[PDB]
Amino acid sequence: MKDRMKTVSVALVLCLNVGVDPPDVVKTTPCARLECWIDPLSMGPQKALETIGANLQKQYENWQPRARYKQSLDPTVDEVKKLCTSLRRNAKEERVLFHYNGHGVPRPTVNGEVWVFNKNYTQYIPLSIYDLQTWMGSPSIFVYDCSNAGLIVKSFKQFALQREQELEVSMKNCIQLAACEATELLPMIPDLPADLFTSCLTTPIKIALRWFCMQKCVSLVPGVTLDLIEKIPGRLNDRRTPLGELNWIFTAITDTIAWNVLPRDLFQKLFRQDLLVASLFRNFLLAERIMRSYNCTPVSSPRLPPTYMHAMWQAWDLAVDICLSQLPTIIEEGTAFRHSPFFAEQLTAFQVWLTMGVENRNPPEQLPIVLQVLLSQVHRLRALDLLGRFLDLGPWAVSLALSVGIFPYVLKLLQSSARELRPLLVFIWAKILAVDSSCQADLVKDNGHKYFLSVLADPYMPAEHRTMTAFILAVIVNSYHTGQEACLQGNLIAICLEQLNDPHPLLRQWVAICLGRIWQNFDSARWCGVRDSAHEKLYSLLSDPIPEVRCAAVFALGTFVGNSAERTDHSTTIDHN
């Protein structure tokens, strides 16, 4: 995935005109005017606005801490033009995220008219989507929390078409997320936050658990209610706490659904190219599931197939139910938190599938789970074993593994301090290189080649793994033309010469092949070759009963002399012999 375009800056544009209700507002009892978990009435018209803005910033920093922050509170016209221009100047080629709230603004028109003014509501100021597109002509992501949000998307597309037609005398670069369709309004529900769509996109948990408590017709866990849900301990990233485990499961499920629903052409673009885009779409699927129950249909561009019907959501509810049954006692008594069996069962199902896999079958649905399991230190050995067994099938099995992104993770596992992982990483890399030798020198740019040299050096490792290691080294030496120096720095020649006497036919063949491949166009190991009289040992393999070994010996010996002769000098003695 060479296309690594990233988001650089985020613009937060708020129109939360606290204390002012547009004339088309229906009020008030169930209004539930809770925004970013803040009730503005308890603080007043100025403190509340700044506090809400601060929380919105915090909610976004949780997903991309490195983003450049930019914020406007009730900007009018020049304020927005200047903001967009400054952000474009900050990064002209990268993506910009534009988040428009609109809660304090009358329902949008076909032009996007907004209630921004110098503290006098009679100055509605009509705006133009076309002009906004002009200011931000870079690749960009738009988020709309408007009631008739779909209307904006439709106008946006029509204006983009208009511009293209004018240019015949941005459409393909923009991504849009709209809260709901142009013909429906956001729900007025006394128990939900007003900014429901934002909450779903920015705080996937919280509302997910609140909804669980409210939506369930008959609760199956007596004693668990919101008073405890809001007291669940732990950091979102602390993998060993309740919330940590829940976030891990949530991520695994939403990735599995995306993998098993979308075409690969969209999957790679939306869930791999950019960390923020992938996070937003991952949460979008939840927003769709929740908002469906209130007669709202979130709208996005590009359009995705519906997913609320997928079976995996049942697994989520089960996992949530199990967690929550322990919450009371942990709070009341302090009992240790027990981990769920979720990943163990998913691995078991994968293992069952492996019983008899063929090309003429649907691929396993759980590869995105194995990818997640490999990130921890609990079930890593089992996931690596099962992955190996999967990869042992014909080349098609490897291609699927490549398409999900095993590669960049096994490159990291290659340099761990563990030793017990040796035969697994060797097997996996032997199969990957056997199928895909085009890897752009990743094993020789980093220190991975050193690992395999040490693996070869280990005198107690079984011959099967020594053979695979020799194969790997031969491949990277002939394949990359940068490992040519590294194989000499580690004295690979000395190791191969010592190993020429190994009784196993394949170690004899691959060691001879490694030596032949080393002595190609090296000046340093032209001299090292002649210096150590390496040929003196290789010709003894010409006596080997097995013709495959004799062929390997003839190859290595002929190559040795053919290249050593470039000097001639005293080595002409060798050349003739």
């Binding site: 960390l275 490999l374 992104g405 990291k412 596992l413």
Partner: peptide, 8 residues
């Protein structure tokens, strides 16, 4: 680098 953290 990686989209997800690894406990190396």
């Amino acid at each position: 680098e990686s989209q997800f953290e690894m406990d190396i």
